[PDB]
Amino acid sequence: QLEAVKGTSDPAMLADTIAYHATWTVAEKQEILELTDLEARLKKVLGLLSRDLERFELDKRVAQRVKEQMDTN
Amino acid sequence: MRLPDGTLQVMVEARARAQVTDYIPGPYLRARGEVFSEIFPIDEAVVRVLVEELKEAFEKYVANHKSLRLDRY
């Protein structure tokens, strides 16, 4: 998906590609296909990516404080 | 527009407000009115200021309901 996605006008393959990028259970995917409104799909998936961002920042947090605690010890 | 499933669609445009004198017991019902109520704008300065304030209120209101199904245009 390097050059196959960049510059694409199609929203539906793009959006459900995000849906199977959301690494959670099949039950989450059936919860997606319960919802018929696309806006709430994309908004709660933005919420998923925001909590992915805090996972990212909490990982850099624990990594930074673990190696400074280590070498100060 | 008529449809064979029992639902008849109609596209109406309201013209002016009016009084109702009396109803006749139907079905179907008929009603009549004495005069056609019409109003003329007088002293359009404060009226124009209130039209501008309603324009400001609708402009600040139109871009809020992102997921509550409200169009922009």
mmCIF file of all heavy atoms in Angstrom, chain A residues 30-52:
data_model
loop_
_atom_site.group_PDB
_atom_site.id
_atom_site.type_symbol
_atom_site.label_atom_id
_atom_site.label_comp_id
_atom_site.label_asym_id
_atom_site.label_seq_id
_atom_site.Cartn_x
_atom_site.Cartn_y
_atom_site.Cartn_z
ATOM 1 N N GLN A 30 -18.145 -6.524 13.436
ATOM 2 C CA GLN A 30 -19.595 -6.648 13.354
ATOM 3 C C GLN A 30 -20.272 -5.448 14.008
ATOM 4 O O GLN A 30 -21.347 -5.034 13.571
ATOM 5 C CB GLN A 30 -20.059 -7.961 13.989
ATOM 6 C CG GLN A 30 -21.483 -8.399 13.610
ATOM 7 C CD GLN A 30 -22.558 -7.781 14.483
ATOM 8 O OE1 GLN A 30 -22.302 -7.401 15.626
ATOM 9 N NE2 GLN A 30 -23.772 -7.682 13.947
ATOM 10 N N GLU A 31 -19.652 -4.873 15.048
ATOM 11 C CA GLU A 31 -20.136 -3.614 15.611
ATOM 12 C C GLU A 31 -20.020 -2.467 14.614
ATOM 13 O O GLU A 31 -20.832 -1.536 14.648
ATOM 14 C CB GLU A 31 -19.363 -3.268 16.884
ATOM 15 C CG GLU A 31 -19.733 -4.109 18.089
ATOM 16 C CD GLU A 31 -18.825 -3.859 19.280
ATOM 17 O OE1 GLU A 31 -17.806 -3.155 19.120
ATOM 18 O OE2 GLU A 31 -19.131 -4.373 20.375
ATOM 19 N N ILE A 32 -19.006 -2.507 13.749
ATOM 20 C CA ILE A 32 -18.927 -1.551 12.648
ATOM 21 C C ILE A 32 -20.078 -1.762 11.674
ATOM 22 O O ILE A 32 -20.799 -0.818 11.328
ATOM 23 C CB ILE A 32 -17.568 -1.656 11.931
ATOM 24 C CG1 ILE A 32 -16.426 -1.224 12.846
ATOM 25 C CG2 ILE A 32 -17.562 -0.815 10.666
ATOM 26 C CD1 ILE A 32 -15.061 -1.556 12.288
ATOM 27 N N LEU A 33 -20.281 -3.005 11.228
ATOM 28 C CA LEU A 33 -21.320 -3.252 10.229
ATOM 29 C C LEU A 33 -22.734 -3.229 10.812
ATOM 30 O O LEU A 33 -23.704 -3.331 10.051
ATOM 31 C CB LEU A 33 -21.076 -4.578 9.507
ATOM 32 C CG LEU A 33 -19.845 -4.653 8.600
ATOM 33 C CD1 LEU A 33 -19.769 -6.017 7.951
ATOM 34 C CD2 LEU A 33 -19.854 -3.561 7.546
ATOM 35 N N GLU A 34 -22.877 -3.115 12.135
ATOM 36 C CA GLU A 34 -24.152 -2.710 12.719
ATOM 37 C C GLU A 34 -24.486 -1.283 12.317
ATOM 38 O O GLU A 34 -25.631 -0.961 11.983
ATOM 39 C CB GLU A 34 -24.101 -2.812 14.248
ATOM 40 C CG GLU A 34 -24.175 -4.201 14.848
ATOM 41 C CD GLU A 34 -23.996 -4.171 16.356
ATOM 42 O OE1 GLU A 34 -23.659 -3.092 16.888
ATOM 43 O OE2 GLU A 34 -24.194 -5.217 17.010
ATOM 44 N N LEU A 35 -23.483 -0.415 12.354
ATOM 45 C CA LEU A 35 -23.685 1.005 12.135
ATOM 46 C C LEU A 35 -23.855 1.291 10.651
ATOM 47 O O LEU A 35 -23.043 0.858 9.832
ATOM 48 C CB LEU A 35 -22.494 1.770 12.703
ATOM 49 C CG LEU A 35 -22.461 3.287 12.645
ATOM 50 C CD1 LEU A 35 -23.642 3.869 13.386
ATOM 51 C CD2 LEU A 35 -21.171 3.728 13.282
ATOM 52 N N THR A 36 -24.928 1.999 10.299
ATOM 53 C CA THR A 36 -25.143 2.380 8.907
ATOM 54 C C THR A 36 -24.642 3.788 8.611
ATOM 55 O O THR A 36 -24.443 4.131 7.441
ATOM 56 C CB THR A 36 -26.626 2.259 8.554
ATOM 57 O OG1 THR A 36 -27.393 3.129 9.395
ATOM 58 C CG2 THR A 36 -27.106 0.825 8.743
ATOM 59 N N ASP A 37 -24.428 4.601 9.643
ATOM 60 C CA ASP A 37 -23.942 5.961 9.453
ATOM 61 C C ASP A 37 -22.419 5.981 9.350
ATOM 62 O O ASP A 37 -21.715 5.573 10.276
ATOM 63 C CB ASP A 37 -24.403 6.846 10.610
ATOM 64 C CG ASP A 37 -24.026 8.297 10.419
ATOM 65 O OD1 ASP A 37 -24.676 8.981 9.602
ATOM 66 O OD2 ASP A 37 -23.073 8.748 11.086
ATOM 67 N N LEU A 38 -21.919 6.491 8.223
ATOM 68 C CA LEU A 38 -20.484 6.501 7.947
ATOM 69 C C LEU A 38 -19.742 7.498 8.835
ATOM 70 O O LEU A 38 -18.560 7.294 9.158
ATOM 71 C CB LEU A 38 -20.249 6.831 6.471
ATOM 72 C CG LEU A 38 -18.851 6.725 5.851
ATOM 73 C CD1 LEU A 38 -18.419 5.272 5.737
ATOM 74 C CD2 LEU A 38 -18.813 7.414 4.494
ATOM 75 N N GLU A 39 -20.420 8.580 9.229
ATOM 76 C CA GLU A 39 -19.777 9.637 10.001
ATOM 77 C C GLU A 39 -19.399 9.159 11.394
ATOM 78 O O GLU A 39 -18.304 9.463 11.881
ATOM 79 C CB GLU A 39 -20.704 10.849 10.088
ATOM 80 C CG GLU A 39 -20.949 11.546 8.762
ATOM 81 C CD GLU A 39 -21.902 12.718 8.895
ATOM 82 O OE1 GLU A 39 -22.471 12.899 9.991
ATOM 83 O OE2 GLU A 39 -22.083 13.458 7.905
ATOM 84 N N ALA A 40 -20.278 8.386 12.037
ATOM 85 C CA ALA A 40 -19.956 7.872 13.361
ATOM 86 C C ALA A 40 -18.881 6.793 13.297
ATOM 87 O O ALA A 40 -18.069 6.688 14.228
ATOM 88 C CB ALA A 40 -21.217 7.343 14.044
ATOM 89 N N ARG A 41 -18.865 6.002 12.207
ATOM 90 C CA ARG A 41 -17.760 5.083 11.930
ATOM 91 C C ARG A 41 -16.433 5.813 11.946
ATOM 92 O O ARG A 41 -15.556 5.499 12.757
ATOM 93 C CB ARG A 41 -17.893 4.445 10.547
ATOM 94 C CG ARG A 41 -19.112 3.643 10.221
ATOM 95 C CD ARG A 41 -18.997 3.213 8.768
ATOM 96 N NE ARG A 41 -20.259 2.788 8.184
ATOM 97 C CZ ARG A 41 -20.667 1.533 8.116
ATOM 98 N NH1 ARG A 41 -19.913 0.563 8.614
ATOM 99 N NH2 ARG A 41 -21.839 1.251 7.563
ATOM 100 N N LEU A 42 -16.304 6.823 11.083
ATOM 101 C CA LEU A 42 -15.030 7.513 10.914
ATOM 102 C C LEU A 42 -14.665 8.336 12.148
ATOM 103 O O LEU A 42 -13.481 8.488 12.466
ATOM 104 C CB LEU A 42 -15.074 8.375 9.653
ATOM 105 C CG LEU A 42 -14.677 7.743 8.307
ATOM 106 C CD1 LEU A 42 -15.613 6.657 7.806
ATOM 107 C CD2 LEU A 42 -14.533 8.827 7.263
ATOM 108 N N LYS A 43 -15.663 8.814 12.902
ATOM 109 C CA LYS A 43 -15.356 9.574 14.111
ATOM 110 C C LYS A 43 -14.855 8.671 15.236
ATOM 111 O O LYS A 43 -13.864 8.995 15.905
ATOM 112 C CB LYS A 43 -16.578 10.371 14.568
ATOM 113 C CG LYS A 43 -16.291 11.268 15.762
ATOM 114 C CD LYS A 43 -15.325 12.382 15.375
ATOM 115 C CE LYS A 43 -15.094 13.349 16.520
ATOM 116 N NZ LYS A 43 -14.099 14.393 16.154
ATOM 117 N N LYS A 44 -15.516 7.527 15.462
ATOM 118 C CA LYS A 44 -15.033 6.604 16.489
ATOM 119 C C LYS A 44 -13.728 5.933 16.078
ATOM 120 O O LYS A 44 -12.917 5.571 16.935
ATOM 121 C CB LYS A 44 -16.107 5.572 16.834
ATOM 122 C CG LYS A 44 -16.859 5.902 18.125
ATOM 123 C CD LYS A 44 -17.774 7.099 17.989
ATOM 124 C CE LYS A 44 -19.068 6.753 17.288
ATOM 125 N NZ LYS A 44 -19.930 7.958 17.152
ATOM 126 N N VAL A 45 -13.476 5.800 14.773
ATOM 127 C CA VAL A 45 -12.171 5.305 14.346
ATOM 128 C C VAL A 45 -11.091 6.386 14.510
ATOM 129 O O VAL A 45 -9.936 6.071 14.830
ATOM 130 C CB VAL A 45 -12.283 4.738 12.914
ATOM 131 C CG1 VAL A 45 -10.948 4.418 12.337
ATOM 132 C CG2 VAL A 45 -13.070 3.444 12.944
ATOM 133 N N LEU A 46 -11.444 7.674 14.358
ATOM 134 C CA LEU A 46 -10.528 8.740 14.779
ATOM 135 C C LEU A 46 -10.265 8.695 16.278
ATOM 136 O O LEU A 46 -9.157 9.006 16.726
ATOM 137 C CB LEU A 46 -11.061 10.123 14.400
ATOM 138 C CG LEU A 46 -10.903 10.640 12.972
ATOM 139 C CD1 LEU A 46 -11.609 11.987 12.803
ATOM 140 C CD2 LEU A 46 -9.430 10.756 12.585
ATOM 141 N N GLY A 47 -11.274 8.317 17.062
ATOM 142 C CA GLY A 47 -11.048 8.090 18.482
ATOM 143 C C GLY A 47 -10.109 6.924 18.739
ATOM 144 O O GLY A 47 -9.267 6.976 19.643
ATOM 145 N N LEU A 48 -10.229 5.869 17.929
ATOM 146 C CA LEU A 48 -9.316 4.732 18.014
ATOM 147 C C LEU A 48 -7.890 5.141 17.660
ATOM 148 O O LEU A 48 -6.930 4.710 18.303
ATOM 149 C CB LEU A 48 -9.789 3.602 17.097
ATOM 150 C CG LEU A 48 -11.077 2.876 17.482
ATOM 151 C CD1 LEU A 48 -11.439 1.826 16.437
ATOM 152 C CD2 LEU A 48 -10.930 2.256 18.857
ATOM 153 N N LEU A 49 -7.733 5.991 16.647
ATOM 154 C CA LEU A 49 -6.389 6.409 16.257
ATOM 155 C C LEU A 49 -5.813 7.416 17.249
ATOM 156 O O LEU A 49 -4.596 7.450 17.458
ATOM 157 C CB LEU A 49 -6.399 6.968 14.832
ATOM 158 C CG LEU A 49 -5.028 7.273 14.223
ATOM 159 C CD1 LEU A 49 -4.158 6.040 14.303
ATOM 160 C CD2 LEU A 49 -5.168 7.698 12.780
ATOM 161 N N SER A 50 -6.669 8.198 17.911
ATOM 162 C CA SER A 50 -6.199 9.077 18.978
ATOM 163 C C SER A 50 -5.734 8.275 20.184
ATOM 164 O O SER A 50 -4.701 8.592 20.797
ATOM 165 C CB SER A 50 -7.304 10.046 19.382
ATOM 166 O OG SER A 50 -8.370 9.346 19.994
ATOM 167 N N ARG A 51 -6.473 7.221 20.541
ATOM 168 C CA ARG A 51 -5.973 6.392 21.623
ATOM 169 C C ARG A 51 -4.770 5.562 21.178
ATOM 170 O O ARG A 51 -3.915 5.247 22.000
ATOM 171 C CB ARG A 51 -7.091 5.548 22.243
ATOM 172 C CG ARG A 51 -7.814 4.520 21.404
ATOM 173 C CD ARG A 51 -7.215 3.144 21.604
ATOM 174 N NE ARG A 51 -8.087 2.076 21.136
ATOM 175 C CZ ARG A 51 -8.914 1.401 21.929
ATOM 176 N NH1 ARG A 51 -8.980 1.680 23.222
ATOM 177 N NH2 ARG A 51 -9.672 0.437 21.434
ATOM 178 N N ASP A 52 -4.631 5.283 19.881
ATOM 179 C CA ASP A 52 -3.382 4.723 19.364
ATOM 180 C C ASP A 52 -2.221 5.704 19.543
ATOM 181 O O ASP A 52 -1.091 5.299 19.861
ATOM 182 C CB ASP A 52 -3.564 4.349 17.889
ATOM 183 C CG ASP A 52 -2.440 3.474 17.351
ATOM 184 O OD1 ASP A 52 -1.548 3.076 18.124
ATOM 185 O OD2 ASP A 52 -2.463 3.191 16.127
#
